[PDB]
Symmetry: D2
């Protein structure tokens, strides 16, 4: 054989991937996660799982054909979860998505049913994985993943408000003429209608914008900064209305979270976690708060100081989400 003429093999294999990531679902969100992760060099192996064989194989092939331009030497796919074995991070994007005028919360019974199959099959083959949930309603489905998997809370993460805050910071940037990296501000709570802009923390160079205008984000605000939060809440729906779905931004947001996990960075992200014990919340609610993210998932939670109004808005989001949790049928 030509190969053996050209190459002397010196070593019996033992290929056990060291930085493997799995993306479950090859819809537009999942493939946006994939290309973003590939282009950030975060993994030595990428596996894709879905239920439509042809679509899955074609997406796998299309990525493989770009390998020259990449640094991820093994891209694989199967309907069978054994392909995901030894993943450090498994990203769940499968399930029904919201239509125009439909709340993400309306997706819950359909995606719970799907999760009942996906989660046990995922955790089966990857004892070291973190589970990053992207499917919606993301906060409820992170709770669901946690309950079905039996994983400890640090290992079950929801993409949560990482995108909402990125959007908030983009829109703020545009108003001030400053790059979003230098515009700081947190949208917490539900990834959806009841999210909470934390005006008290919104700043450039440590300068509190609320300190300069204490009516920031209220109806009295002459510059109507609340509209920036409204734009954040409406963003997914506006993009859905224009191009049919969203993909690129969530892909990049998920890639940003993957980077923190895979590279043990311990950056702070507003992502879905259990918050029993904070802000007077006494039940097992999952919602976005600022969490320190690394190789063991969420190891630490930042206790954001909230005004009485912000705290009320967060408890409100927490009641909403708990109310849907009480509808869950395991």
């Amino acid at each position: 054989a030509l190969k053996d003429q050209l190459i002397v093999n010196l070593l019996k294999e033992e290929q056990v991937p060291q930085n493997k990531i799995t993306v479950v679902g090859v819809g537009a969100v999942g493939m946006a996660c994939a290309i973003s992760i590939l282009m950030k060099d975060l993994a030595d192996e990428l596996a894709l799982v879905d239920v439509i064989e042809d679509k899955l194989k074609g997406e796998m092939m299309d990525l493989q054909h770009g390998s020259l331009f990449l640094k991820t030497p093994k891209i694989v796919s199967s309907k069978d979860y054994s392909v995901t074995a030894n993943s450090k991070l498994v990203i769940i994007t499968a399930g029904a998505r919201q239509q125009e005028g439909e709340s993400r919360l309306n997706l819950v019974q359909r995606n719970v049913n799907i999760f009942k199959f996906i989660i046990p099959n995922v955790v089966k083959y990857s004892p070291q994985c973190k589970l990053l949930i992207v499917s919606n309603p993301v906060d409820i489905l992170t709770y669901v993943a946690w309950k079905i998997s039996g994983f400890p809370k640090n290992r079950v993460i929801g993409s949560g408000c990482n995108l909402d805050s990125a959007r908030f910071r983009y829109l703020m940037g545009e108003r001030l003429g400053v790059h979003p990296l230098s515009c700081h501000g947190w949208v917490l709570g539900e990834h959806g209608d009841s999210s909470v802009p934390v005006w008290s923390g919104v700043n450039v160079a440590g300068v509190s914008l609320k300190s300069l205008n204490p009516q920031l984000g209220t109806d009295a605000d002459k510059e109507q900064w609340k509209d920036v939060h409204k734009q954040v809440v409406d963003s997914a729906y506006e993009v859905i209305k224009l191009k049919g779905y969203t993909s690129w931004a969530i892909g990049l947001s998920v890639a940003d979270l993957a980077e923190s996990i895979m590279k043990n960075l311990r950056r702070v992200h507003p992502i879905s976690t259990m918050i029993k014990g904070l802000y007077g919340i006494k039940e097992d609610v999952f919602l976005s708060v600022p969490c320190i993210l690394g190789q063991n998932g969420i190891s630490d939670v930042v206790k954001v100081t909230l005004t009485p109004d912000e705290e009320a808005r967060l408890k409100k989001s927490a009641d909403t989400l708990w109310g849907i949790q009480k509808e869950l049928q395991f």
Copy 2:
């Protein structure tokens, strides 16, 4: 104003602007890969479907926190493309299941009659990167319509075909594609030419280890690797309905050589009149040095009698189509 309370302003054009024409799957794959390789300080998108266009723009803009391209704009109106260093054309009818890219030619020539003069109007000194199919004929057309000197009119050509060939060779050999070397030239399509004479790892000619390499007499039928290269788009189209990611990555690799003036060699579409035994204004892929002025030099690959035959055949097939077309 809050802004004025916060910031003292002291000072009232982009220098590395890229435009992508067409926000179909190819176009948007180009856009995401360009954004993720930090090649541009402004990205403009142009298409004719207003809602689709604005939505893709917005979806990109929402990821800005995670990118280093501070201005992302879109419009149907080509004034948005002004001052582009590079303009990438991906628009037009796209390859369909079970059909040659050559089936798309007249309709795309018609559309280029509109797009190209509008691009030239707002960026008279850009480099044009044609991706639309059939890319070899459309690169020629772009050149004729624009009036640009030929160095500034480049087709994505066989960059991707060669990438696919090096992936497949790497999979056979257990080696990364970066370390597997080999060229697919000619048409970006069914008449492409694998230059077996050049295929090598670490400077070791595979033909030296297997003289029949790529012929019918090759006991390990490496010709099938080229067959896989030719069929690849057809199979991917059959499976997922179009191709996007590999071509976006390929186009971004080329944008990088242009924007960074790398002078790397790529098998990309250029006018081959008076080279490799060819007499008409045919564009096809040969290895070209690519940089800030586009294509400045061509590598004269030493072709076997056959490889030269296949290459002249690929040229004939294309000039066959190009001949009998109206513009």
Copy 3:
């Protein structure tokens, strides 16, 4: 020629670089700036200039030999400033540097005299450039480079406290178990002994550490956070005491500023610019305050809200700098 057999030239070769950077000085600082810039792919041409013929050629050669691993296709050097033609960014690292036990301010007479030569030669060949001053005392020398150059003040930028703030954020993250990217805090004023830690802006996820612990950074602070700023002031002197000089941190700091300039990012950095008009300051003092940095340099200045003590401290830094700058002749 083999070249002509191999290659047909189709185009006359009128090369003019589009993203050229020059580094003046190939001491440890300049070469650290060089390698960091080269590894962030910010330039299509790198020019080096110094006065020691052999050292310059050797440094250039060593970089050139790495070209396969880089994406900067032309690296050149010369004593003659014609080598620097057409630069978009020129970085000045040349001049005397402080010994152990010597103030950066003690370098000023030597480095003013050298700037009288360097600055007109840079401007002669790079009429479109921004000037990034790194040579010390950086605040006074930015003022000097501005005066000599005839450039507008937006295009004459001092590396300032970009490094001091990076040190502060590193030390803070170390204490808190958080990546520096998520620890926010500004050190302003002189890049030197009179710098000001802005405790009122120090935060994680928008949470003010001073609201948590009002004594933050005072002598009554039970965790002695003032020790963090003292480590920042002393950093250069400690590293100089240990390895003889500093290089890697300042190289990375300068590369960070080069990125914002070359990619027109409009990030906010604490860098040296004129502050006449703010904080009661009447004279042409240059010091660090947070500025928006982009392709035309510093286009905007953020007005940080300072406590009375912080502001008094910033005004004293200005006074210190004016004390030396008022005596300069050039």
Copy 4:
């Protein structure tokens, strides 16, 4: 405590890194390897070891102070090898270095002695690491580390001719007006004076320069391409004369090798390995041939077809190294 007021901790972590790299030796070569590996985001922990305590701690601090600009969250140093525990890759750059005019082979007994201390300490704390030898003479010192470590030969790699081949490709590029990435050519054998340029493999776009010019690299060569290989052999001496040492190109070369290993790329590099059984070599000689390099080190060797003259040169290189190697006191 302020940390606890700010942050709630969820779990006591496994603080064991997944992608740890250690650099032994913090002279110019070691620190250029360090800055390059930092800027390529290859590791989640960088450990430095050397024997001079002050210089060691100064270099650690200087790197540490740039953390904000990096994605390597822990940088540590110690003269104690406990600091290196759980390294995936340990890069040995320590020992005496070429003075001006000095042959790398002249360093051999000094560096074998240093290695009798270094290697067992490294192996104690990372029994599963790959070893990357950079110290000179690198071929013989790779043999020494292999013998002392007791590792299987796949896990003991010498940086070899990776740099010599990068230099060759740089020079060919500047001759042809092509980027080094698109110029191909292999320099094999000893990293030093007896290296062998393989003229038969020298190509652009698969076009053999020898096919164009049948006298390429020979005494008859109109254009004296052999000068190009002479320049490769002479490069380190020239740079040492000019700047006193070499650092940047070797830093970049070592980082490129680290990348292949750490990301399991399975690229081919001309690096130091045992070539017993090739080219009629009957003894445990280490020298550079093209090797497939990945997460288990050197898994495969490409068999280059050499002319009789090229093979004779290569066996000459083999004999030279074996003369010294075969009599080592250890």
